[PDB]
Paper text:
However, in the vast majority of prokaryotes, including M. tuberculosis, CoaB and CoaC are encoded by a single gene to produce a fused bifunctional enzyme (CoaBC). CoaBC converts 4′-phosphopantothenate to 4′-phosphopantetheine in three steps. The product of CoaB is then decarboxylated by CoaC, an enzyme of the homo-oligomeric flavin-containing decarboxylase (HFCD) protein family, to 4′-phosphopantetheine. Transcriptional silencing of individual genes of the CoA biosynthetic pathway of this pathogen identified CoaBC as uniquely bactericidal within the CoA pathway, highlighting it as a good candidate for drug discovery.
We therefore set out to obtain a full-length structure of a mycobacterial CoaBC and we successfully solved the MsmCoaBC structure, which shares very high sequence identity with the M. tuberculosis orthologue (86% full-length, 84% CoaB enzyme) and hence is a valuable tool for studying M. tuberculosis CoaBC. Here we report the structure of the bifunctional CoaBC of M. smegmatis at 2.5 Å. The final model (residues 2–412) covers both CoaC and CoaB, but densities for several residues in three loop regions in CoaB are not observed (residues 290–298, 336–342, 363–376). The N-terminal CoaC of MsmCoaBC (residues 1–179) forms the same type of dodecameric arrangement seen in other HFCD family proteins, such as the peptidyl-cysteine decarboxylase EpiD18, and it sits at the core of the dodecamer with the two domains connected through a small loop region (residues 180–189) that tightly interacts with both. The active site of CoaC sits at the interface between two protomers of one CoaC trimer and a protomer of an adjacent CoaC trimer with the FMN site facing inwards towards the hollow centre of the dodecamer. Each CoaB of MsmCoaBC (residues 190–414) dimerises with a CoaB belonging to an adjacent trimer. The full protein resembles a tetrahedron with CoaB dimers positioned at the six edges and CoaC trimers at the four vertices. The shortest distance between a pair of CoaB and CoaC active sites is ~30 Å. The absence of dimerisation for the MsmCoaB when expressed alone suggests that the interactions between CoaC and CoaB in M. smegmatis, and likely all other Mycobacteriaceae, are fundamental for CoaB dimerisation and activity. The organisation of CoaBC is similar to other HFCD family proteins but unique in the sense that it contains more than one domain and highlights how the arrangement of the fused enzymes is essential for mycobacterial CoaB dimerisation and function.
Numbering used by the authors:
A (entry chain B): 3 to 150, 158 to 290, 302 to 335, 343 to 363, 377 to 412
B (entry chain C): 2 to 151, 154 to 291, 300 to 364, 377 to 412
C (entry chain D): 2 to 150, 157 to 290, 300 to 333, 344 to 363, 377 to 413
Write the structure that this text describes.
């Protein structure tokens, strides 16, 4: 259960944010060794990383040579996380440099490698960085899309920790395969009002919707995410946020952005009905099916971009295979998980995290779009 | 003059003390050696060791003795640059084109053959960045030796080849700059080498005086040019296993043919350079004044006939070896072409106890030189033939 | 465990990069090795090198790790201390009883065997201060390897030699007394090659190791050794041993003839072939002839007073064994399939171990026989 993680820290202003990544990985029961660059010590000192990780902090290969630390750290690692990954670090990782303990450890690691780049937009968008990021991606490393006045800010420490424990559970979880895919996602419970202060709502976290949006984003999809009431979820890096209120405001937001979308995933738990009298200081009216309405602009001919629609269902193997054909979605998800597509294929989602399940969902979407 | 100027670059690997004997052997062979270590190499082996072994000063940066314009004169005057060990860091700097210490600045300056001898932990060696860099150095004209694998649990490639292997591959490039193109990639080659031992008893036996140097040389040259080489060796003159070849040790000629028949199906090229014993001893006792002899099987003929009977499909080139002393009944090329059509070989190496003859009709006079230089002429023709077939 | 603890000390000679191969070899043999360099050795080989090979920390003075009592525990837990190279300066400090760095402090506290492998320029080695210091260390119970051979003596012996002798002292502490000073010895080793024609021949699977061992142990105990070698398993010349190679068994007979006069000990350890082929073809069924018993030829000349100086002859290869010695005429006989029979009837069972170990027993028996007539 307790995995061995290396946390590489390169020399960026965001280095103090790695402290939080180390503390959380440690709180989750994991064994963390911090390997900073020399230039990271100009930002956070070895003492801080030594107290948070509980293990010694060294920057070069020529210390504790008797314990062969330049190979053993990488050979025994279950994951390598670099946060922040500077342009310089990425440039060295691509070149295959091994001139400090962090880059030598990268060459030795035969485990998943997660870069969380952080830098100024101009650096991130410079053609050397762009090619370097592409090369690391095609070599099998995960390079998180940074957050956004432009792109380049380090993703929040929770997003990095979550994606780290994801790769610990499933090494192939985040291939850079959904490039060029545009995706509108919905998540969170909607709030149907009856008062400028009071309302009716439900208990959905939004986590699985957010999880699916995050996994799409970190696999290359240009994601747009319309959220309602969430369990205080913070926005995923690189996804465009559109916050909404009512189950009606959800519909308008969908039909505002859905034409540009290539893929749409209804994870929102929209409430069935809706009140009709809103006193400014029990008259319900049943709300429209936003998912089912999408399949119809589908047919009526104004979604010549849409190539996949996925639905979420609440708990029976065969009892649900009817719902996908009836609802007209390209595939449907349900957990008491099981995934069912419109080609008859069905698979049971082995138990896991909302993000781990989100990867199975995003896998089944990629396969569907291949079959076209 | 036969005295060449060698630059020995030493990068920061555990193997740096092995570079010491490399410089000792090259100076003992009359060459003039300048050692250019990286700064990290100095934490493994001291400058004083290299100054005493080479007799020349040892510096790591370009800003020393800039009056003697050493950052260019050191490269401009070298006949060979050898890097041993070449670390993953150093290969990466050479590929990027860095010139930030004296060694890498010498690499941009040198116009002579350039020999890297990598040494690393296997995981560094198989890392995609390392393998891309090795490919780029090779496409750019450098020779990058395939490392050794010397075990049980911590085996795998990445070990520095033995100094003798490095020094004799260094001398090869001093003699022939184009000796080691990476051209045999994708071919599997089976090589026999050495003499055989035909037992009279457990203790005594009949044998010949074969050193094995010929076959080992072609195995080595094949390995260092890309081939996945297997080497069936009998008795040799204490020859170290070449870097990157699978080794199989046999005692007798019967034991050789069983070993050849065991590995020939996976092979693309077979090199019969082993001096195989013509006749055996009739009775093998168990302890100890006229001993009878029985003829052994012609394993080389055994392979061509099995090939013509469809039992060796992926076999594409069978090269035999022949010893020669003078020509009277015809010329040497006349009798060799007859020996080549009769045995069914694709290539015949006639040893002047050089001549290279080919089933395509090619013939070539091998000039005198080192056994390893002759192996490159041989491997050239094995390549030339495979292009034809 | 068979895992013994070895201290390899390294002093500041050009030969320090050769100690790296000693450390690796002792480590491949399963032992735990702690390298203790002098400060001036770090000018030649870095601490980082010795750390990667030894797998153990590398320190140079006594004040590091004072908590885990290293100034003393490094010596009093060692099973062997080998110094390679041992410079003149190190030998002088060891004789003085200096302890001003970790290596010298370790030497004063060790109670196991101590093996010095000196290496230096010949003028340093033959300077009277060094000569005296080498004699004091030998007198005091240390083993000081005679170094190898500009062309003079003082080269570090090969690593394989040092590790061989290191593992020998791990098996027998008293194995290399400096007892055979002045003795002229001549040894034969290896198999022999009787040619049929210029390229073919008939050989035997003799390694030469057992004969090389006896020549090595003799030279490192004080003797001047001439080794006549046949076909060996690619063996390296022992340091301090005039080498003479031979081919056929008559070429050996010819070689023992030239050199046996000057000698005081003959160790007929070669596996000489008894039969030679009928004729050399210079290019069926092979008839053969017989070769001279070299050992029996050797006892005859001694018996006819042709070898005045030779005081001991040893043969090789105890039901009929005691009779074999009396029939051979040899002074001692080594029987392997060990047992060592003497020319005064006393026999001893050489408990089988390393070849070099039983070589020290063979030299033991030679030593007692030479002191018999002294
Ligand atoms: C205050 C400050 C903040 C920096 N932030 C970043 C950054 O966020 N990303 C980046 O690539 N470089 C950043 N740099 C530049 C790096 O310090 C520089 O590239 C350095 O060599 C670190 O690389 P390394 O940690 O991989 O060795 C910053 C520099 C300074 C002075
Ligand atoms: C004990 C030890 C052994 C090492 N061995 C190697 C090696 O064999 N190959 C390698 O590429 N790197 C090795 N390294 C990593 C290098 O020391 C490091 O990459 C160094 O910066 C290489 O730089 P250079 O280009 O100056 O050699 C080793 C490091 C240590 C501590
Ligand atoms: C390149 C060089 C090689 C040397 N080699 C030896 C040597 O092999 N033996 C020796 O006794 N002194 C040698 N010396 C001289 C010194 O005595 C030696 O390096 C050092 O001072 C001895 O100190 P130590 O006790 O640490 O060995 C050498 C000096 C140099 C500069
Ligand atoms: N007002 C609503 C309510 C539900 N949804 C969508 O409908 C699906 C689930 O509704 P349904 O087809 O009725 O199946 P259930 O799981 O039973 O519905 P519920 O959410 O109430 O559990 C989800 O994909 C959700 O996006 C919708 O379109 N608009
Ligand atoms: N029993 C044997 C003996 C020889 N060979 C192969 O055949 C070649 C030489 O056979 P041979 O006809 O005896 O060669 P010659 O032309 O007579 O020259 P020489 O024997 O002196 O080498 C060598 O390549 C050897 O590898 C073989 O396969 N089987
Ligand atoms: N031609 C020979 C053969 C034997 N020896 C010596 O004799 C010893 C071996 O004894 P040996 O009598 O040859 O052993 P056996 O196998 O019994 O041989 P033999 O028929 O002679 O008894 C060795 O020291 C060896 O060097 C010798 O001097 N010359």
């Amino acid at each position: 259960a307790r995995k061995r993680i290396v946390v590489g820290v390169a020399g960026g202003i965001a280095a103090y944010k790695a402290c939080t990544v180390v503390r959380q990985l440690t709180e989750a029961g994991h064994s963390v060794r911090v390997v900073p660059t020399e230039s990271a010590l100009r930002f956070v000192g070895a003492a801080t990383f030594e107290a948070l990780s509980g293990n010694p902090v060294h920057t070069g290969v020529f210390t504790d040579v008797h314990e062969v630390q330049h190979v053993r750290i990488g050979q025994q690692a279950d994951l390598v996380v670099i946060a922040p990954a500077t342009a310089d670090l990425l440039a060295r990782a691509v070149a295959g440099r091994a001139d400090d303990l962090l880059t030598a450890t990268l060459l030795t690691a035969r485990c998943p490698v997660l870069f969380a780049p952080a830098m100024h937009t101009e650096m991130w968008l410079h053609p050397a960085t762009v090619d370097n990021v592409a090369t690391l991606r095609r070599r099998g490393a995960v390079v998180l899309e940074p957050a956004s006045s432009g792109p380049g800010r380090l993703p929040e420490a929770e997003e990095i920790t979550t994606l780290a424990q994801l790769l610990l559970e499933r090494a192939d979880a985040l291939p850079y395969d959904m490039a060029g895919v545009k995706a509108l996602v919905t998540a969170g419970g909607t709030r149907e009002p009856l008062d400028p202060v009071r309302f009716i709502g439900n208990r959905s976290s939004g986590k699985q919707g957010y999880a699916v949006a995050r996994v799409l984003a970190q696999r290359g999809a240009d994601v747009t995410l319309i959220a309602g009431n969430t369990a205080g979820l913070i926005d995923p890096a690189g996804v465009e946020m559109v916050h909404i209120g009512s189950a009606t405001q959800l519909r308008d937001a969908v039909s505002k952005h859905a034409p540009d979308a290539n893929v749409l995933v209804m994870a929102a738990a929209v409430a069935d009905f809706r009140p009709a009298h809103v006193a400014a200081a029990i008259d319900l009216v049943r709300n429209d099916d936003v998912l089912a309405g999408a399949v119809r602009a589908r047919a009526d001919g104004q979604l010549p971009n849409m190539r996949a629609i996925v639905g979420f269902a609440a708990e029976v193997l065969f009892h649900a295979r009817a719902k996908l054909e009836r609802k007209g979605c390209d595939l449907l998800v349900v957990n008491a998980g099981w995934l069912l597509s419109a080609d008859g294929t069905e698979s049971a989602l082995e138990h896991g995290s909302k993000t781990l399940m989100a990867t199975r969902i995003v896998d089944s979407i990629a396969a569907f779009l291949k079959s076209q």
